From a paper:
Citrate synthase (CS, EC 2.3.3.1), an enzyme involved in the TCA cycle, catalyzes the condensation of oxaloacetate and acetyl-coenzyme-A (CoA) to form citrate and CoA. Thermoacidophilic archaeon Sulfolobus tokodaii strain 7, which grows optimally at 75°C and pH 3, has two genes encoding two distinct isozymes of hypothetic CS. One of them encoded by an open reading frame (ORF) ST1805 is termed ST1805-CS, and the other, encoded by the ORF ST0587, is termed ST0587-CS. We confirmed these two isozymes to function in high temperatures as CS and determined the crystal structures of them at resolutions of 2.0 Å and 2.7 Å, respectively.
On the other hand, ST0587-CS exhibits 51% sequence identity with CS from hyperthermophilic archaeon Pyrococcus furiosus (PF-CS). ST0587-CS crystallized into an orthorhombic crystal belonging to P41212 that diffracted X-rays up to 2.7 Å resolution. In this crystal form, the asymmetric unit contains one monomer. This citrate synthase also forms a dimeric structure, the 2-fold axis of which coincides with the crystallographic 2-fold axis. The final model is comprised of 373 amino acid residues and 40 water molecules. As observed for ST1807-CS, each subunit is subdivided into a large domain with 11 α-helices (C-G, I-M, and S helices, residues 1–212 and 321–373) and a small domain with five α-helices (N-R helices, residues 213–320). The N-terminal region is folded into three strands (residues 18–21, 26–29, and 32-33), forming an antiparallel β-sheet, whereas an intersubunit β-sheet found in ST1805-CS is absent in ST0587-CS. In the structure of ST0587-CS, six putative substrate-binding residues (His180, His215, His254, Arg263, Arg335, and Arg354′) were also structurally conserved. The numbers of ion pairs composed of residues of opposite charge situated within 4.0 Å were 36 and 55 in each dimer of ST1805-CS and ST0587-CS, respectively. In ST0587-CS, an ion pair network was organized by four residues, Asp93 and Arg96 in G helix, Lys211 in MN loop, and Asp198′ in L′M′ loop of neighboring subunit, and continued into hydrophobic center of the helix bundle.
Residue numbers in the entry:
A (entry chain A), B (entry chain A): 1 to 373
Write the structure that this text describes.
Amino acid sequence: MEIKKGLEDVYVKETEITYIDGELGRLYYRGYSIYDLAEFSNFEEVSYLILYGKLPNREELNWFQEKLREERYLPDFIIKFLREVRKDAQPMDILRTAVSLLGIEDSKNDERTDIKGIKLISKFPTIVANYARLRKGLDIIEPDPKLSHSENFLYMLYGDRPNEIKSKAMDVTLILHIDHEMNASTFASLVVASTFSDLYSSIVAGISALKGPLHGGANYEALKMFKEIGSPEKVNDYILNRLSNKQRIMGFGHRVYKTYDPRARILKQYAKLLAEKEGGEIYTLYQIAEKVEEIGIKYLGPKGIYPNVDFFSSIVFYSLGFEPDFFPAVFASARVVGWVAHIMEYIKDNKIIRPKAYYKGEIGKKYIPIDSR
Amino acid sequence: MEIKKGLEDVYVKETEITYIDGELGRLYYRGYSIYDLAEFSNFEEVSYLILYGKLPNREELNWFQEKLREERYLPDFIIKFLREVRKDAQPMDILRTAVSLLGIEDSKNDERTDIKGIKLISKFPTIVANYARLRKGLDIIEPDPKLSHSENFLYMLYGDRPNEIKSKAMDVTLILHIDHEMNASTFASLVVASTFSDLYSSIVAGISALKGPLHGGANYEALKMFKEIGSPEKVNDYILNRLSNKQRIMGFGHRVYKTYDPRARILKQYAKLLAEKEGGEIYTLYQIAEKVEEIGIKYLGPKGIYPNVDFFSSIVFYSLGFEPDFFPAVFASARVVGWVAHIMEYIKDNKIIRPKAYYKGEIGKKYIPIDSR
């Protein structure tokens, strides 16, 4: 008799994958600290950790990143799709459709869902980079099997190998987005998966939810804010003006964290490094951002709202050569690893997710003929 | 502290759209009896009822079925998709992808979500029929704006206008599938919709869940059963053999109905009429089915399991010229009206659906170097 609309404060699964202490500002993947993973690991190793629940030994990881380079190539049909398609399409809708097409082109039904997962995960960056070039009137530049995941992403975007700070930054950035708290998109995945529909279907649902505007994170309005604050001399009137007629500060606040976002803390170092190595309009943006961070923490911090990952992730994505409407799709590249993991975890004891609805209408109405209406 | 995995017995919304009394075998759309709707209404009128919550007057319905014929045409890109695509693709995956593409080709963002809904709903049959022809090596035969929804569906399948019993049957069949009890696919829709992602996204999630094998209804294993029971002399050993080593009887039982499915009762008349008007292998199938219904009700009825809509819907779909792997997609044609309705209803007071997950793992693990592993 109590309608739990929103499912806020209902538990839909147990999990071993990701733990967040929003009180202490702590984040663990399989019980490993995101700080340590950011510092000592990489995308490939962290993905294995998260899919399989433990750090790989040298042979396991070697097998794992072998599958990951092996299947980066898109089939011709979907590549045909990419260059033939409307070029003012939303990159998310491109990603959604391409994954859907990938499902059609896949005919191996004997395949373990994790193997199917690897290959999907490995193609996201190829879809994303390929569309970005095509959109800019350049040409598909193919994945280089020799390269590691994050380097190859930037490779297929630039056409040339990225310098090592850029690919580090890319790698840590993707690591920071692989998984987080149960949400609409991870859950949309699980709903589809719990009917044992195919992996591609589930991931299409994940993307379909993630691109929703109401979805937490994937905001990137923060870059826009830094932009319209012109100088960093201008920042305090801007922000104080915003607060006085209570308007949000982009890249601040969080549904779970009541402290500085550990992902933001980690990502800040790369935002700063990239910016100061670029030196341009983009270094001045970073200067804006510190000024905003400073006064933002001052006024908002005592209410337990601080900068979050989006606050720096949008400077970084920018420095790394992506255009703002690709940001969510690069997010998706990371998060799809999380989606696959949860699906794997959820379907060991599958339960099809079918909630109830409470009918509060009338019944037994007489069917009235249309002229009498 | 209680994990509600499956969300069985959790209410995720109030609703005014559809009411099922599984105890009394009753089914209402907007408080109108499905018996009366089947008998006195049509697909177009029932769709309006369900989208808007009341029977239309002559001007409202006239407007409504105007929109419905106006937008049946698919854009060239997706038609290009259809004839270019793998022809051993699952019709559901075709439908999923096409709807996704439809989203890309749509650039009207100022559009009411119900108007967007009409046009989507009207194109499903065009996608389905077009693929069925192309798959069979025939050619796209375009929608005839002059015709009504259900007649035009069969038209685009056959290439010629269907006789009136066939289009009646089609019409009532689609009516019977527009909406039903909250489930994985309607809910997958709602999860995406509750982030205010676009309609196409939500519907892609709906299809993605509906094609899941674990999903209630959309079974159509019943046709297969009638087929392998050769004569209807053969039926009693077959079924009794099945029951003795407890195997399910296809087209029987239901999660909510503990009586004869009202939709099955209504659909039976058309299964019977179509069959006996065909007279062939397909009339003998129907004879099989009655025999199975008879002994099935005898042995299973006292446990409150009876035939359900799938029991006859698969004979009908068959008689109407569809191949068995198109059955779910014709289902989808109907149900998408329900999906649109629920989304419309859910987002008047939107709440983004983000459940919680309970972490039952460890934290604070020490990151061990890969050689030490």
